[PDB]
Design an enzyme around this catalytic site. Structure first.
Site: not given
Lengths: 57, 287, 117, 299, 122, 97, 100
Positions: D6, D10, D12, D14, D125
């Protein structure tokens, strides 16, 4: 003077179809100048795993 | 912990722990013998009780190291670290990972989880080691940090027996006036809590009940008993049944505390020499 | 709010600036007894633009029904269950920049017979 | 077995696929960090918090760290794959502009918020995104990197945290302490966006965002929670005459009008609570929250 | 400047790499990928050089490049629009000149003495 | 602005090449050669369009002057229409009353 | 294409008009629509525990005592976090558990 000079005489040295438009190219990577990509990771050094992956045949 | 998570990692009774430690000792012994570095049952292999004694003395040294940290440290962070260390050797052996690396690492990971936001100079300043040797240890610390979480089953939250103590004392300031100004009770209870922390109490008993038992022991030592407070908790479900369970847990806690003693340094140094020789033995992993 | 049939609401400024495009806006001037904040044409105005969104949504959509260029501009109140499903609620007709509610063929007759008798 | 890429993240990267084990679809995370220092800080704080908090928080409106491994330097976190995200959905040109569906999204988000507040762990957040929609459409909250516990003991409470556009007014001042207030005001800005269709208050940088927050709700009254200027860093903002909620989002049903007025209330003390908001009569009304079977799906 | 020649050598190396990896090769064709990575490193050096150069370019250059023409056509079109606006403005000022001349002619016809004193004062 | 685009292009190129090198051993090698030459076409197109940019970088300042000219002439056109507008607002509003 | 597409098929018969001429051509009316789906998941009680219990608002001796390690403080109070949040967290956590 004629201003329809080709995208050749302009970009002439590079091989391949430089004149071909981005829509014709159909490349996700090409769509980048219009919207800037994020610098998620800094450039990394080449590794042995890459060469093992290629090495042609 | 009605928040679950530790509901899975609450081992229920003394024997299971004993068995698990014993089994990991066997596991390392066997892997090594099978690899066939050595003939079975050589002198080097240790014994589980000896390993446990070495671990406890070294852990008391680790607690002193946590106390001498140059930045002020919340009691929560120290506790988190000890618990993490005990739970780590319930899955593996002392020899597979040297206790010094494990102690330092538990400490750094603990600080990162508990939001102490430690400054990098403060951590290096606290260690009494040469910068080059501290950096060599730090390189190992990185790999052993990931290794810790892998063998910790990624279950990181640890319940710390403090919060309950403050809470019970506020209940004290409100529901029962029979006792008064329970702060002598406060210090004695702290003394009982450090001694409770050294034991496998964290693993077995519930932490809230641990705080309640510390308060009860302090009260019995000084001249007050909380039958009435126990009676307000009896103003609850289980009717009569709750009190018998509470009394049995309190008695078992008192017995472990009276029996637990710091391991003698003379015995501990013999053990240290043996383990040092042991890790100096050829392991070597894989190519 | 006593009787919506017996209320008339108007405004002079909007009167000269009135056109087939602005009839809904005139009904929408707010502080108009006939129309309501609950209507979705109002929810749309809170958001940006207006198009086939009344069909994507299916709710209270005041829509112009019939229009004569100078004065006559009839508005209809619909309640949609789904796209291509319309339920007419009421009709408000604007004559000479004066908004009235269309009387029921029967409430009008009842009042009329009562006064005469 | 990695089956899809995918993309990066930020802190990491995926990949979407089926694991070494069952064929079920799941999203696989790979740890990302700047490891160049020979004195790396090991794993990052955001990662550490996110993994344990997700593992602990198990709720039909919360995603959870399911499986987790890490044989190599790599640390692998397993989270269920979701359909997309509310943010891009409403960001796109009105594809299926629908209203009670917005109310259903708000209900799922509020149930998730109530569970997180009950578990005693603030979601530091929520941002417009960082909220994910699955195929069924049950929306469960996701990004948990910046969250922290909130408790009785005094400790350095982190400051200047939520994304500028969605920022709590007390945090905008410069407040050293905080409470459920941050999460509540932020759900409030996300609802604002669903109704208005574009972001409510735009701030290029801290001061400008505080200015607009004040322009949208007017100058806070002296009665509100005086000490609003007595918190550590305050600057008298413009003396706006003030605009009613009716002014910024022009209209909708007044019950919605009331939830908004309430999440907004300035005194952090009065910012409405999660249980309080569910108990609002707006949720129990003639308009029915969508079951999610008919929930709108784009491409 | 130098970024052009550097990226040009990078593009030619990319073309030679595509040609070589297109062909079955006994020789270690990993040198092509290594030269591609080294070209990325030299492009990072050229990005430092672009921080030195600081070029600001409008978006319609990017879009005409997407159309595959010369950006020289965009230069001609900007020059043509500049001359179009200059032609229109000079024409409006020229009609105002002719109108002022006509007005003073007709007012000098109808008001002799006043336009005489105006032509005196100017 | 071209420095930011150059850096972002180099970053996206290196990252896509990293993904390609990661899947390089993973992909079936015979068709992986085809995927490699497709990626090489991607990079060649990115670099040739950057080459067109750095070609036009000589012609940038003339277009800056052209933008200045166009803004100036648009301003003078707005001056003409504003004069006519204020004369109409004199002749129809203030003198009638 | 005479049969493939329309080719003046439905353009021939137009049935006078039923949109501009007059809107009274509806005649054949119908409805009978139902859904029965409203007021779903209003209930907020998901409370779970394996512990004793404690109320959210104190208004008791604990609130009257208003005393912690540092009690409460005024400037940060703007920060919110009225000690109230404080004792609640404290007690709830302590009570959590007590019986495995």
């Amino acid at each position: 003077k004629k201003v329809k000079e080709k995208l050749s005489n302009f970009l002439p040295d590079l091989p391949g179809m430089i004149d071909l438009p981005g829509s014709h190219d159909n490349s996700s990577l090409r769509s980048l100048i219009e919207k800037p990509p994020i610098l998620s990771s800094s450039f990394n050094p080449i590794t042995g795993t890459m060469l093992a992956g290629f090495r042609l045949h | 912990h009605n928040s679950s998570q530790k509901r899975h990692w609450t081992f229920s009774s003394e024997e299971q722990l004993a068995r698990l430690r014993a089994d990991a000792n066997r596991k390392f012994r066997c892997k090594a013998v099978a690899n066939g570095k050595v003939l079975p049952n050589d002198p080097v292999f240790l014994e589980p009780h000896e390993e446990m004694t070495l671990c406890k003395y070294y852990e008391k040294r680790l607690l002193e190291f946590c106390s001498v940290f140059k930045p002020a440290m919340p009691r929560s962070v120290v506790g988190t670290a000890c618990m993490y260390f005990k739970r780590f050797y319930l899955n593996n052996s002392v020899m597979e990972y040297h206790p010094r690396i494990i102690m330092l690492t538990c400490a750094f990971l603990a600080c990162k989880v508990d939001e102490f936001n430690v400054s990098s100079p403060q951590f290096v300043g606290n260690l009494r080691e040469s910068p080059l040797g501290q950096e060599k240890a730090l390189e190992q610390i990185l790999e052993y940090e990931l290794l810790l979480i892998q063998q910790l089953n990624f279950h990181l939250i640890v319940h710390n027996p403090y919060r309950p103590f403050e809470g019970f004392l506020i209940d004290l300031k409100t529901r029962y006036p029979i006792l008064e100004n329970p702060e002598i009770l406060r210090k004695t209870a702290d003394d009982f809590l450090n001694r409770i922390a050294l034991t496998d109490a964290y693993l077995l008993y519930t932490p809230s009940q641990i705080a309640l038992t510390a308060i009860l022991s302090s009260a019995s030592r000084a001249g007050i008993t909380m039958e009435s407070y126990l009676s307000e908790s009896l103003m609850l479900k289980e009717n009569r049944t709750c009190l018998s369970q509470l009394l049995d847990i309190m008695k078992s806690m008192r017995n472990l505390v009276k029996k637990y003693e710091p391991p003698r340094s003379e015995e501990v140094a013999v053990l240290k020499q043996k383990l040092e020789r042991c890790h100096s033995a050829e392991l070597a992993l894989n190519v | 709010r006593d009787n919506l049939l017996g209320i008339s609401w108007v405004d002079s400024s909007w009167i000269p600036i009135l056109n087939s495009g602005s009839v809904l806006d005139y009904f929408s001037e707010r502080s108009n007894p006939f129309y309501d904040r609950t209507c979705n044409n109002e929810v749309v105005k809170m958001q940006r633009l207006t198009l086939e969104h009344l069909n994507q949504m299916v709710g209270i959509e005041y829509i112009l029904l019939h229009a004569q260029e100078p004065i006559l501009f009839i508005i209809r109140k619909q309640q949609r269950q789904s796209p291509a499903q319309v339920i007419p609620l009421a009709d408000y007709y604007i004559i000479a920049g004066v908004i009235y509610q269309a009387p029921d063929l029967g409430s009008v007759i009842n009042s009329r017979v009562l006064t005469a008798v | 077995e990695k089956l899809d890429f995918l993309g990066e993240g930020q802190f990491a990267t995926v990949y979407k696929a089926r694991d070494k084990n069952t064929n079920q679809i799941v999203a696989i995370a790979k740890i990302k960090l700047g490891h160049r220092s020979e004195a790396k800080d090991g794993i990052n704080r955001t990662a550490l918090r996110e993994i344990k908090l997700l593992q602990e928080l198990s709720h039909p409106n919360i995603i959870g760290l399911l499986d987790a491994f890490g044989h190599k330097s790599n640390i692998s976190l397993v989270f269920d794959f979701m359909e997309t995200d509310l943010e891009v959905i409403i960001k796109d040109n009105s594809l299926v502009l629908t209203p009670s569906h917005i109310k259903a999204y708000m209900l799922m988000t509020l149930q998730g918020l109530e569970y997180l507040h009950q578990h005693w762990i603030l979601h530091r957040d929520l941002k417009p995104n960082n909220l994910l929609l699955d195929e069924n459409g049950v929306l469960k909250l996701a990004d948990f990197g910046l969250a922290k516990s909130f408790g009785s003991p005094n400790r350095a409470y982190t400051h200047q945290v939520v994304t500028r556009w969605y920022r709590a007014p007390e945090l905008l001042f410069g407040a050293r302490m905080y409470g459920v207030g941050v999460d509540m005001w932020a759900v409030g800005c996300i609802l604002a966006e669903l109704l208005l269709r574009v972001p409510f208050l735009p701030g290029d940088s801290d001061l400008d965002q505080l200015t607009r927050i004040f322009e949208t709700l007017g100058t806070p009254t002296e009665e509100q929670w005086p000490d609003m200027c007595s918190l550590p860093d305050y600057v008298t903002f413009k003396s706006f005459p003030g605009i009613p909620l009716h002014h910024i989002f022009s209209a909708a049903g007044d019950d919605l009008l009331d939830l908004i007025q309430g999440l907004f209330l300035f005194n952090p003390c009065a910012r409405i609570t999660a249980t309080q908001a569910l108990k609002m009569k707006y949720f129990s009304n003639r308009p029915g929250p969508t079951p999610g079977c008919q929930l709108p799906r784009p491409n | 400047h130098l970024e052009e020649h550097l990226e040009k050598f990078v593009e030619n190396i990319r073309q030679l790499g595509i040609i070589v990896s297109d062909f079955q090769p006994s020789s270690q064709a990993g040198l092509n990928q290594k030269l591609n990575f080294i070209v990325t490193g030299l492009q990072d050096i050229d990005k430092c050089r672009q921080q030195l150069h600081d070029i600001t370019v409008p978006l319609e250059v990017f879009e005409y490049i997407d159309q595959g023409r010369n950006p020289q056509l965009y230069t001609k079109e900007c020059l043509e629009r500049a001359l179009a606006k200059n032609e229109q403005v000079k024409g409006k000022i020229d009609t105002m000149k002719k109108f002022k001349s006509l007005l003073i002619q007709e007012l000098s016809k109808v008001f002799p003495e006043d336009m005489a004193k105006y032509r005196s004062i100017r | 602005r071209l420095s930011t685009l150059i850096e972002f292009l180099l970053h996206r190129a290196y990252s896509e090449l990293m993904v390609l090198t990661d899947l390089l051993p993973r992909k079936s090698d015979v068709e992986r050669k085809i995927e490699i030459v497709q990626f090489a076409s991607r990079t060649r197109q990115l670099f040739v369009r950057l080459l067109a940019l750095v070609k036009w970088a000589n012609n940038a300042g003339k277009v800056e002057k052209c933008a200045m000219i166009s803004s100036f002439l648009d301003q003078q056109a707005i001056l003409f229409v504003d004069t006519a507008d204020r004369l109409a607002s004199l002749a129809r509003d203030a003198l009638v009353h | 294409q005479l049969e493939m597409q329309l080719e003046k098929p439905k353009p021939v018969k137009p049935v006078t008009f039923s949109t501009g001429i007059k809107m009274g051509q509806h005649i054949s009316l119908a409805p009978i629509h139902k859904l029965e789906e409203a007021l779903y998941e209003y209930q907020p009680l998901q409370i779970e525990t394996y512990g004793p219990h404690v109320p959210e608002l104190e208004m008791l001796g604990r609130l009257g005592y208003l005393n912690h390690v540092r009690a409460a403080s005024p400037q940060d109070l703007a920060g919110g976090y009225t000690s109230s949040l404080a004792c609640h967290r404290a007690l709830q956590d302590a009570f959590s558990g007590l019986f495995w």
